[PDB]
From a paper:
[name] is the best understood component of PfPCRCR and interacts with human membrane protein complexes containing the erythrocyte receptor basigin. Antibodies which target [name] are highly effective at preventing erythrocyte invasion and the most potent growth-inhibitory antibodies bind a single epitope. Here we use structure-guided approaches to design a small synthetic immunogen, [name] which recapitulates this epitope. Structural biology and biophysics demonstrate that [name] is correctly folded and binds neutralising monoclonal antibodies with nanomolar affinity.
The most effective growth-inhibitory antibody from this panel, R5.016, bound to an epitope which overlapped that of 9AD4. We previously determined the structure of the R5.016 bound to [name] and find that 13/15 of the residues on [name] contacted by R5.016 are retained in our epitope mimic designs. R5.016 bound with lower affinity to [name] than [name], although still in the nanomolar range (115 nM vs 2.4 nM). We next determined crystal structures of the [name] epitope mimic bound to scFv fragments of human monoclonal antibodies R5.016 (at 1.63 Å resolution) and R5.034 (at 1.75 Å resolution). Comparison of these structures with those of [name] bound to R5.016 and R5.034 showed significant similarity, both in the fold of the epitope mimic and in the interactions that it makes with antibodies. Of the 15 interactions formed between [name] and R5.016, 13 were retained with the epitope mimic. In the case of R5.034, of the 10 interactions made with [name], 9 were also observed with the epitope mimic. These structural alignments also confirmed that [name] more correctly recapitulates the epitope for R5.034 than that for R5.016, with R5.034 binding closer to the centre of the [name] immunogen, while R5.016 binds more towards the tip of the immunogen, where the structural similarity to [name] starts to diverge. Production of our focused immunogen involved grafting the 9AD4/R5.016/R5.034 epitope onto a small scaffold protein and redesigning the resultant molecule to ensure that it folds correctly. This was successful, with structural studies showing that both R5.016 and R5.034 bind to the synthetic immunogen with the expected binding mode.
Author numbering: 5 to 76, 86 to 119
The structure:
């Protein structure tokens, strides 16, 4: 049903968002203290970008599949809600990357 599809897509996006927040918390807590050379910063930035781009692939897949299922009344309200949730997740993922680059450039 459109109700189950909506609820499940939102639940999956919430899980991806929490995984991104937990990853960010783990960066600040578990990362080791070494000489922050230009090379160290570039190596860490490319890995963080790769990790966050893979989180974005998961969010994109959940959103595209939810929209596709809702396409095949209140169904339009659900599509708007899932798309708004996908956009906000994308902005949050972008804000994590920006804070991480600022954190490495300290």
């Amino acid at each position: 049903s459109y109700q189950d599809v909506c609820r499940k897509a939102k639940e999956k996006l919430d899980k991806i968002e929490m995984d991104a927040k937990n990853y960010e918390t783990n960066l600040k807590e578990q990362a080791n203290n070494a000489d922050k050379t230009e090379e160290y910063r570039k190596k860490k930035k490319i890995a963080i970008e790769a990790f966050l781009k893979k989180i974005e692939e998961a969010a994109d897949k959940v959103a595209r599949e939810a929209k596709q299922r809702l396409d095949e009344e209140e169904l339009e309200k659900c599509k708007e809600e899932v798309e708004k949730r996908a956009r906000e997740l994308r902005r949050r993922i972008r804000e994590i990357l920006e804070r991480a680059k600022k954190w490495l450039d300290q």
